[PDB]
Design a protein around this ligand. Structure first.
Ligand SMILES: Cc1ccc(Nc2nc(N)nc(CN(C)Cc3ccc(Br)s3)n2)cc1
Length: 275
């Protein structure tokens, strides 16, 4: 059960765009913080129409269950505003935003070791979720949030978090799942009830492809029908431009869900690259 935030303490400043049946804003939350200090905290606001009751309930149940598992690589949600005809998730505002946009804005002038570090951090988050048997179901590079850039002087690496899960693919329209190929795995295209921890291993592979491809979207040239044929003919993605993780990508994007490796195994594989 999330902390309730009053509409009166939320200021909406910028309209940023949309997610899946959500509207996204930058704003400020007025709050009493540590030592009783009054703060105006920057927040990322995700707004759902309460008339889409099934979507809203799925969205907030997913955010709540994940926010019960505090972890350094899982986004902080401050709470929720049951805000009239809308329900609003109040999330921390991450300074550098989504990783796919970041990589594009930096023109993929990012070395493989940076990419490896981000993959290790995501894998650490996913291992924690796996140990907690919590399915995320929407792993993608847009949901990797960059808290801090690398600092070459100190040797500090970039630092990421994984965003909230959003509406479950067990509730979303089939057309949305197909648009989300190749993040949504083939078994969930066949039947969304096949959602399983194995789903996240597949999507982790697709996410690593995105990271290695500078924020390109795999299969962007394919409409939904060509994306179905992609899975029918059992194709794999092409090796990304930075090919060091291509084997891992393909091992995670296994058409047999039960064969996808555990996140402990994935981490050991990541740790073994470059001796
Ligand atoms: C330009 C800029 C810079 C930083 C941030 N900060 C941020 N903080 C959080 N917590 N999450 C996100 C990304 N998630 C996927 C929500 C969004 C979906 C669509 C958009 Br557009 S933002 N961005 C946002 C915009």
């Amino acid at each position: 059960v999330f902390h309730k935030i009053r509409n009166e303490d939320l200021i909406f400043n910028e309209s940023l765009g949309q997610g899946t049946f959500t509207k996204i804003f930058k704003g400020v939350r007025r709050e009493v913080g540590d030592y009783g200090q009054l703060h105006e905290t920057e927040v990322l606001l995700k707004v759902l129409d309460k008339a889409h009751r099934n979507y809203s309930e799925s969205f907030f149940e997913a955010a709540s269950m994940m926010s019960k598992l505090s972890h350094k690589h899982l986004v902080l949600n401050y709470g929720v505003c049951f805000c009239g005809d809308e329900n609003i998730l109040v999330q921390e505002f991450v300074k550098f935003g989504s990783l796919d946009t970041y990589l594009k804005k930096n023109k993929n002038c990012i070395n493989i070791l940076w990419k490896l570090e981000v993959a290790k951090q995501l894998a650490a988050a996913m291992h924690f979720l796996e140990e907690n048997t919590l399915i995320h179901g929407n792993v993608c590079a847009k949901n990797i949030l960059l808290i801090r850039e690398e600092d070459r002087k100190t040797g500090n690496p970039p630092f990421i978090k994984l965003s909230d899960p959003g509406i479950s693919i067990t509730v979303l329209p089939k057309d949305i799942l197909q648009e989300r190929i190749p993040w949504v795995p083939p078994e969930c295209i066949e039947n969304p009830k096949n959602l399983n921890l194995a789903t996240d291993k597949w999507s982790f592979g697709t996410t690593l492809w995105e990271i290695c491809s500078g924020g390109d979207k795999p299969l962007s040239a394919l409409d939904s029908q060509r994306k179905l044929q992609f899975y029918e003919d059992r194709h794999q993605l092409p090796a990304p431009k930075a090919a060091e993780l291509a084997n891992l990508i393909n091992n995670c994007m296994d058409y047999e869900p039960d064969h996808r490796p555990s996140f402990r195994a994935i981490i050991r594989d990541l740790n073994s690259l470059f001796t």
